[PDB]
Ligand binder design. Sequence first.
Ligand SMILES: Nc1nc2c(ncn2[C@@H]2O[C@H](COP(=O)(O)OP(=O)(O)OP(=O)(O)O)[C@@H](O)[C@H]2O)c(=O)[nH]1
Ligand SMILES: [Mn+2]
Ligand SMILES: [Mn+2]
Ligand SMILES: [Mn+2]
Ligand code: NA
Length: 603
Amino acid sequence: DFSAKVIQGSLDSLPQEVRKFVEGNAQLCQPEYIHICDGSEEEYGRLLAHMQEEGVIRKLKKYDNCWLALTDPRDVARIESKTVIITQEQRDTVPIPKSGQSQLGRWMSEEDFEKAFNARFPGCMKGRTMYVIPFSMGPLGSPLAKIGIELTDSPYVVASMRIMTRMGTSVLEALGDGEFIKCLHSVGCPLPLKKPLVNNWACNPELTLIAHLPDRREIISFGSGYGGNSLLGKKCFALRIASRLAKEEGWLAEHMLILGITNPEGKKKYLAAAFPSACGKTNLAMMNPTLPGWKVECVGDDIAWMKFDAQGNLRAINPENGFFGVAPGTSVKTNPNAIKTIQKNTIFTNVAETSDGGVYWEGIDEPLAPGVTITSWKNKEWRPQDEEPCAHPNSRFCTPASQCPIIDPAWESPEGVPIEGIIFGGRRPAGVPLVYEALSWQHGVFVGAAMRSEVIMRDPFAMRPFFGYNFGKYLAHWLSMAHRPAAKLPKIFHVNWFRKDKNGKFLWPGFGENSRVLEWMFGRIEGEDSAKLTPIGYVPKEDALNLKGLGDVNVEELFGISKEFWEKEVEEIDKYLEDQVNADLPYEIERELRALKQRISQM
Ligand SMILES: Nc1nc2c(ncn2[C@@H]2O[C@H](COP(=O)(O)OP(=O)(O)OP(=O)(O)O)[C@@H](O)[C@H]2O)c(=O)[nH]1
Ligand SMILES: [Mn+2]
Ligand SMILES: [Mn+2]
Ligand SMILES: [Mn+2]
Ligand code: NA
């Protein structure tokens, strides 16, 4: 009985299974106190102030209630080498590669994990508060939503989870005796500290391990206080656990923005888009369109949970409550709506600070007044002419979604938004045109499976680091949507903002100008005759894209399709799928590969 150590809420108030989860891990981790979070403003503000007292965060006095965390440089991002999924059989988690090393996930046996767990968690919260975070992934009481309980010894995690999820007492009441995902996190630094504390940032790099146990409905993360490793809703639940739940239950959990686009006529559609990290989902999701009369509105910028309803519409919710966005590169011109969203109630991690209490980073495109100096993310003075950057490259802001000036009116609708188009894309300097459309659902699944991005690494569906289970079975799951009764299969497109000429400059300007590409997609969904058939799919007809105001864009280079390039491309796709997917590659994906190779051979 840990009732004596409860400093907020009550163990008697908890659902029975939530109580078991809290007490079992209180016995294991031996926290000094147990704090059951209520999600209130008072809790949040007080916890922020406490972190301020401790040197854990700094207040940014230029803004309304904004904050800055600088981490230990050993704990700066997700670490894929220490990210694992536990299942009885390896094959259910990853396909058995021919070459012996999988790029599609990392399996650990139950036996090996149990040893690793026992070497980490016993007594790991000594002298710290265990916070109990009840949270909803998705709008409260949406039929597509799912509930988690996160245990953590990090106030930074509590504050960040309040922004990125719906958390507090209302979630506990909505949960009742229903099922939930068990999320256990520790920074791995029990008191008294055995090792030195760097930058007031508790972490344990040597023992860092982020584990997923889909069959036990558990996420167990040790040693890292950062982002995807500690905010257990962000990737661990949102993609890895949820993709497995999605496979079991007949839905999809994807690394996709959701946006609503409205033409000059006022006709509206919703699109989903899967790009890898560093390929601009957040820019597109809250785009300021350069084309007159067009309006883009944001539903989400990172995670899409999608399920075909009884009418056959692909319904998507954003399961997040905020944007955990990359800070460097974000400017007034690249993303004006992000700049507006993050002005208040926002936590920044690993960015630079200006002498007047403002935030700064590479590519911010806001010159400072003379006299204004900059402190870097490493807490040292920094001039533009210095070699190292002022902000870490994967530094982040964590901001409420409700503050976005163009947040979609249906962004919290419990039924979700009807998706009519799915877009894939990444960074390809050569060969791949600006935009094309898949010839069918089966081709579209192949296009997702074939995705690559800048060293050009493969990233099928932008999910390479996030697959909850066997990628081959994931492909089969996607393909099975075509045999679902009444399913209205969205049109699939592939984009490339990053094609370059032989001098290495971008052939397309991008950003708000990408609204010109979205227009074409909109029309194609409407059934307009604006498409020319090519070996790789439908591209826009000559003069079908609005290029007014761009001057002379080199269209023939931008839309050029080379036999020699695509020959090499199909061969490389073949070898990858053969190696990495092998016996689990669906028949239909092999067929699309064979078909594309054949169409290219006839060029
Ligand atoms: N050239 C060009 N670059 C772009 C465009 N859109 C975004 N970018 C670049 O993409 C980067 C920002 O994208 P990120 O925010 O890292 O991508 P994301 O998909 O949101 O990544 P996660 O948040 O990690 O999922 C910056 O380097 C931008 O300059 C575009 O239209 N053209
Ligand atoms: Mn103290
Ligand atoms: Mn993003
Ligand atoms: Mn992401
Ligand atoms: Na710090």
